[PDB]
């Protein structure tokens, strides 16, 4: 059974650091930036 | 931009029913193709050939179809008339192989015909399941003792009937009949469509000499006819192949 579906939004950030603390602020804005666009579909 | 896609053209059923291409499947410079001529890298130059803009105008867009120790080769004839036009071909079948069902082949076969009627797929495979079951133990023989029979062979392809006579030993399996079919077409200069049809009409001839050995058990290995040069020393061959245009 084939279903050509759109893939999920993967948070791929341009500058790539290695410590985690420089990622969470952009990822929390990503979670606000993705779930709010996903809540209106429901 | 300005690039042709790699797919989405299957103008084959129109050439199956074009009535100038010598296809026996359906009934109802000076080159034709630039496979030896360059075009100076302008794709409009391929539109000057009549069999190519025929495929650009009358073409279609397809979706791609998506899908044992000794082979037993059984030639399977398929003769089905279907709304005026018929279906006439011949193909061997590996009876030892069951990787593809005959219903899967018939759904494959009626897609390139652009029929997909879903009752041809039953009727083709029911004939295939008939002819496999009728010949399931007649092509699996174990013939010894140097039968060395003569074979007259005929092949029917669009009023271009091929005919030969040769002595065949169906005891040594050194000569493949498909390889024997290729050596005639290489030397006579025939097209590639006689590579299956001579081999498919020889395996049926083989299982007929296999038949009389296992059904009635008639040996009849009594002087295969020669011209007193090789095997039987009479005074110290039979014929030569030909493609007769009747």
């Amino acid at each position: 059974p084939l279903n050509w579906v759109q893939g999920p939004a993967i948070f791929h950030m341009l500058t790539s650091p290695y410590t985690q603390d420089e990622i969470i602020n952009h990822e929390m804005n990503f979670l606000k930036g993705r779930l709010l666009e996903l809540q209106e579909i429901t | 931009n300005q690039l042709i896609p790699q797919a989405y053209i299957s103008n084959f059923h129109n050439r199956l029913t074009n009535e100038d291409d010598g296809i026996p499947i359906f009934t109802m410079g000076n080159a034709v193709l630039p496979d030896l001529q360059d075009q100076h890298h302008n794709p409009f130059n391929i539109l000057r050939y009549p069999k190519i803009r025929d495929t650009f105008i009358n073409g279609k867009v397809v979706s791609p179809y998506r899908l044992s120790g000794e082979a037993i080769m059984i030639p399977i004839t398929l003769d089905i008339e279907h709304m005026g036009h018929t279906i006439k071909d011949q193909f061997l079948w590996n009876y030892n192989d069951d990787s593809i069902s005959p219903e899967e082949f018939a759904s494959i076969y009626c897609k390139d015909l652009d029929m997909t009627s879903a009752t041809l797929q039953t009727q083709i495979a029911n004939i295939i399941k008939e002819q496999l079951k009728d010949l399931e133990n007649i092509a699996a023989t174990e013939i010894m003792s140097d039968l060395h029979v003569i074979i007259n062979l005929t092949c029917n392809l669009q009023d271009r009937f091929f005919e030969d006579n040769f002595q065949w030993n169906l005891n040594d399996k050194s000569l493949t009949p498909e390889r024997f079919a290729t050596s005639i077409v290489q030397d006579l200069g025939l097209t590639r469509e006689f590579i299956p049809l001579i081999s498919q009409s020889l395996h049926e001839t083989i299982l007929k000499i296999k038949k009389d050995w296992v059904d009635g058990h008639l040996i009849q290995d009594h002087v295969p006819n020669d011209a007193a040069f090789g095997y039987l020393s009479g005074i110290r061959s039979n014929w030569c192949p030909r493609v007769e245009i009747l």
């Binding site: 059974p1 084939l2 279903n3 050509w4 579906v5 759109q6 893939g7 999920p8 939004a9 993967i10 948070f11 791929h12 969470i24 990822e27 929390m28 990503f30 979670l31 930036g33 993705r34 779930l35 996903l38 579909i41 429901t42 | -």
Partner: protein
């Protein structure tokens, strides 16, 4: 924020439902810390 085209046994809404179930846990995990 990169999307994709792929084949799945789920339809588009169930992937969005599975996105709802995955992002809400990550929202609760990240806002708590």
């Amino acid at each position: 924020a990169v999307f994709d085209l792929m084949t799945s046994p789920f339809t588009q809404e169930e992937v969005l439902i599975k996105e709802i179930d995955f992002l809400k846990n990550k929202l609760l995990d990240l806002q708590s810390l």
